[PDB]
Design a protein around this ligand. Structure first.
Ligand SMILES: N[C@@H](CCC(=O)N[C@@H](CSSC[C@H](NC(=O)CC[C@H](N)C(=O)O)C(=O)NCC(=O)O)C(=O)NCC(=O)O)C(=O)O
Ligand SMILES: N[C@@H](CCC(=O)N[C@@H](CSSC[C@H](NC(=O)CC[C@H](N)C(=O)O)C(=O)NCC(=O)O)C(=O)NCC(=O)O)C(=O)O
Lengths: 217, 217
């Protein structure tokens, strides 16, 4: 009944699919397929972009009855509130807002690099900064199981996605940060997550679109 | 007592300053000055970036007692919650999330264009896509005085900033969308807003940093 639309890519829908599975949401998925170079045909999307009742037609989108949602973060927040997977105290909401935005910034830095035709020249640059970036997240998590404390929340589904895809970009990057390694194990070990990661539905790759220099397959 | 730190620029702090003034917040500003070309010295910032108690050192930042916050959206949400300027119903929260994100996307599109050395070559396309963007926000707002309905909320502060800077980018852009024009006048006519816009604290220019090809002054 619920419908998640997005490319046949991990990208921005990863955290979402994971949240939908963790919350036991009843949903199905509409996967749009982009053609290959040099056109990268998007007609499969464009042909019904403005025919879905979306206020701001975009990918990913979530259609839950009367609620038609765009913007990944908004889609996550919607499902999160629906299952009380949100920060409660003021301190938890602050950390929740800071993280939601920080991780998106980090997500975009990697995407920017990977889509750039000068990926090879720019990559060293990114690798140099990775330890510093990871360290801030590591310090923030500290001895806590989840980014907001004792309860798992939606930022954890985001945290997971960007931290893990960095692990696949540079496998050794998390070695110096035990807690982030444990975060990833802790998350993948969750009952509903583990089961889903074994199913056919699980789509960890490709990370990006066919337009990427890295992660395109 | 409350401290807002940012560049001596409009940029991301515009909506924040406007929201602090509207809520009658007791605050002072820490303005960092960037040097000019070709090095664009940022030492004024770098010299204390890691000495402020910030978890993820960044600009803008808000220091409110024990609360040290980064990420413009998070600072806005923080102030908004403190004065009940948030969406209440589920429908309003969804619209609030979608807009916060949609406006940020539009904000970055303009920034990307304005900092790119190929500004003149790229401007034309941006101008060609601007009506479509504006139209979506127009339709969404409809006959409502504010973006979420009857009550003014923080996304309106975001909305104002990005729609307005576009008006300064392309004066006639809002002409075909009366409701957006009225929204700007409506917001600028707000008692606390109007008074602040007449004071010395008002900083509508420069839109961007010295590094921009447009709005650098
Ligand atoms: N803010 C929105 C972004 C939505 C968006 O941009 N959607 C794209 C697909 S994301 S797929 C493309 C995206 N690309 C990038 O992040 C790189 C873009 C940069 N500007 C560059 O080209 O260098 C990506 O890979 N993202 C995944 C990730 O980083 O996790 C789309 O096709 N939208 C409908 C339309 O445009 O018609 C959200 O969070 O939902
Ligand atoms: N997501 C963060 C962004 C914070 C940020 O990037 N801050 C900058 C200043 S923004 S000032 C720079 C930003 N530049 C851009 O948006 C253009 C970026 C492009 N990639 C390019 O450089 O060509 C801008 O003008 N933004 C304003 C707007 O669009 O309204 C900084 O100096 N941070 C501390 C540090 O980096 O050490 C937030 O919302 O707070």
């Amino acid at each position: 009944p619920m419908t998640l639309g997005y490319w046949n890519i991990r990208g921005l829908a990863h955290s979402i699919r994971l949240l939908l599975e963790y919350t036991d949401s009843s949903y199905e998925e509409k996967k749009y397929t982009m053609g290959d170079a040099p056109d990268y045909d998007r007609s499969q999307w464009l042909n019904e972009k403005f025919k879905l009742g979306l206020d701001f037609p975009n990918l990913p989108y979530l259609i839950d009855g009367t609620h038609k949602i765009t913007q990944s973060n908004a889609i996550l927040r919607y499902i999160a509130r629906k299952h009380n997977l949100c920060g409660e105290s003021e301190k938890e909401q602050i950390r929740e807002d800071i993280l939601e935005n920080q991780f998106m910034d980090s997500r975009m830095q990697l995407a920017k690099l990977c889509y750039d035709p000068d990926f090879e020249k720019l990559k060293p640059e990114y690798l140099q900064a990775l330890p510093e970036m990871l360290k801030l997240y590591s310090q923030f998590l500290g001895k806590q199981p989840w980014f907001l404390g004792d309860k798992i929340t939606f930022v954890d589904f985001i945290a997971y996605d960007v931290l893990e895809r960095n692990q696949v970009f540079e496998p050794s990057c998390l070695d110096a940060f035990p807690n982030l390694k444990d975060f990833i194990s802790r998350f993948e070990g969750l009952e509903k997550i583990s089961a889903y990661m074994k199913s056919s539905r699980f789509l960890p790759r490709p990370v990006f679109t066919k337009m990427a220099v890295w992660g395109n397959k």
